[PDB]
Design the sequence.
């Protein structure tokens, strides 16, 4: 059929200041069908008790979701968003970068 | 002249096979999610204190009853259509129904149905109609559906009567949250090298509400037409986020600024100058 | 493979009849529903009639009463008997099938010309 692969965008709520408390966001969008697996990672290991929005969809009917958790950025810690979907050969990871 | 917030009711029904299925729903008033509807639950949950609008508890309860019966019946109809029409699982169906109120006591509505992520049919006036690029078999289904007077009258009056009265109750009950104004914050950053002698300037804007925003890179009052704004991304607290980038040659970056306009600043634009 | 071949088109006076046919290749189990569309020059392709293997039919309002769709499951072919033709019926009439396993789009024929003078 026509299946759409997910777009993954990773960002923080506030300007990252090492040692201060912040929210880590992963917005997953433009995919079809709806079954999807999204994880937030702290140094490659899965984070627990991470919350998400109710699954919704845009005018063109592709689905979108927001996953987010409270976190504290540091100099050496690496954060990412890990997603798996039918359209994907492997799970795709997008690292967080404060730019 | 007052702001316009359409109500759109969304439904995601998924059928993996003849036994496994789930149906979930939500409703939006403008940019805000007012309701949620989970397959595990028996009721439509209200997310805001004003989600019920000016509806009585007994009025809200008969709606809860319609949705209970609709969800069960939607599921059984899909399974019976698939068996009769010989459709192949898995199936994914989406509905997008709702209305918007206008000044003058007028109102327009919609009820669109999608199959595998593409429109196949909609409700127009009094009955079901297929879309232009709808598969052949959808015409056999429209025929059965349009024989069901009760459902056609019910959809007609939900859209032409119930939905507009409901949104107007939401517009006064939620008057205050709909007019709320939250000021954004902006900060600057450098991005990964686009070219050999080039720089990527990044302007971050976070925490504004409502959604309409204006963000552009400037040299004085000359807008830099190379500005690439991203998508407006959500925050967990229902404010928004934006990143606006500009690719420039190293030396021309000096003297550029990032200008942010928003209803919350009352003309006092946020203007950040490049390092 | 799926192969839909049309025949029975031609040129007929206003008021006349015409009968189109569509021969499909494959099992009686691999074709689920058969139908007809038409496209006039420089316009959209409009749905005309559909018929299932069980014999249920649906017609578009423009033609309800003048056209009848029919089916022979033994030879897996569908017919469209066109009566009381008007000049506005001039178009390419296309055959369509709903093939088992492909629910999102039709399989099409190459079309056959119908001119009404
Ligand atoms: C819609 C506006 C609502 C406005 C209210 C504002 C509140 C919003 C807050 C809550 C929002 C929560 C998210 C909402 C999710 C989507 C909402 C959509 C609105 C539901 C409309 C309900 C239709 C009412 C009629 C109904 O339930 N019919 C039932 C029961 O009818 C039976 O039983 C009846 C008595 O119980 C009668 O005896 C009847 O003759 C018999 O046939 C009937 O059986 C209907 O067919 C059920 C489905 C109807 C939708 C069809 C959609 C097209 C499906 C195409 C699929 C093709 C197959 C492809 C594989
Ligand atoms: C219908 O689909 C569901 C979900 O896709 C199937 O349930 C899965 O069954 C496998 C074992 O066969 C389990 O490992 C999964 O954990 C199950 N998932 C869920 C969500 O329960 C179910 O088996 C399918 N039914 C048929 C008859 O094939
Ligand atoms: C979504 O909700 C359905 C009911 O509203 C569930 O179907 C039911 O399943 C029970 C067993 O759990 C059956 O005994 C009953 O006949 C009914 O069909 C359905 O399983 C549920 N799906 C998920 C994924 O939770
Ligand atoms: C919708 O309501 C208006 C106002 O009562 C009425 O004039 C119109 O006929 C209705 N339309 C339908 C499709 O029921
Ligand atoms: O995780 C909570 C989420 O629930 C959603 O349904 C709402 O859009 C938000 O309040 C939030 O993003
Ligand atoms: Cl009940």
Sequence:
């Amino acid at each position: 059929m026509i299946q759409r692969t997910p777009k993954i965008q990773v960002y923080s709520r506030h300007p990252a200041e090492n040692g201060k408390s912040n929210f880590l966001n992963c917005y997953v969008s433009g995919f079809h069908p709806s079954d999807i697996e999204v994880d937030l990672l702290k140094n490659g290991e899965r984070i627990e008790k991470v919350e998400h929005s109710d699954l919704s969809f845009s005018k063109d009917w592709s689905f979108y979701l927001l996953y987010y958790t409270e976190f504290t950025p540091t100099e050496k810690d690496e954060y990412a968003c890990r997603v798996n979907h039918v359209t994907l050969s492997q799970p795709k990871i997008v690292k967080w970068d404060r730019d | 002249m007052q702001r316009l917030f359409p109500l759109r009711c969304l439904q995601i029904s998924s059928f993996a096979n003849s036994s496994w299925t789930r149906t979930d729903g939500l409703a939006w008033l403008g940019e805000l999610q007012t309701h949620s509807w989970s397959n595990d639950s028996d009721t439509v949950r209200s997310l805001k204190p004003w989600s019920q609008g000016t509806f009585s508890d007994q009025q809200w309860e008969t709606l809860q009853h319609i949705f209970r019966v609709y969800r069960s019946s939607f599921t059984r109809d899909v399974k019976e259509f698939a068996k009769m029409l010989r459709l192949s699982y898995p199936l994914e169906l989406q509905v997008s129904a709702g209305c918007e109120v206008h000044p003058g006591n007028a109102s327009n509505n919609f009820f669109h149905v999608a199959f595998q992520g593409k429109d196949i049919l909609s409700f127009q006036g009094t009955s079901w109609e297929p879309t232009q690029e709808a598969p052949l078999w959808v015409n056999l289904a429209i025929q059965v559906l349009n024989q069901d007077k009760w459902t056609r009258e019910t959809v007609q009056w939900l859209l032409n009567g119930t939905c507009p009265q409901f949104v107007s109750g939401l517009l006064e009950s939620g008057k205050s949250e709909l007019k709320k104004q939250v000021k954004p914050k902006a900060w600057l950053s450098r991005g990964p090298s686009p070219g050999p002698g080039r720089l990527l300037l990044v302007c971050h804007v976070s925490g504004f509400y409502p959604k309409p925003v204006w963000v552009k890179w400037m040299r004085g009052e000359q807008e830099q037409q190379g500005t690439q704004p991203g998508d407006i991304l959500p925050n967990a607290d229902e404010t928004w986020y934006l990143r606006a980038t500009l690719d420039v040659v190293a030396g021309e970056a000096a003297g550029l600024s990032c200008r942010v306009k928003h209803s919350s600043l009352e003309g006092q634009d946020i203007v950040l100058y490049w390092g | 493979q799926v192969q839909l071949v049309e025949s029975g088109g031609g040129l007929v006076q206003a008021g006349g009849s015409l009968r189109l046919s569509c021969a499909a290749s494959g099992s009686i189990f691999s074709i689920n529903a058969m139908g007809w569309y038409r496209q006039a020059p420089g316009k959209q392709r409009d749905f005309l009639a559909v018929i299932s293997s069980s014999g249920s039919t649906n017609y578009a309002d423009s033609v309800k009463g003048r056209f009848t769709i029919s089916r022979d499951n033994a030879k897996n072919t569908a017919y469209l008997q066109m009566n009381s033709l008007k000049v506005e019926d001039t178009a390419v009439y296309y055959c369509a099938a709903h093939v088992a396993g492909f629910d999102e789009y039709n399989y099409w024929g190459q079309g056959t010309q119908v001119t009404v003078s």
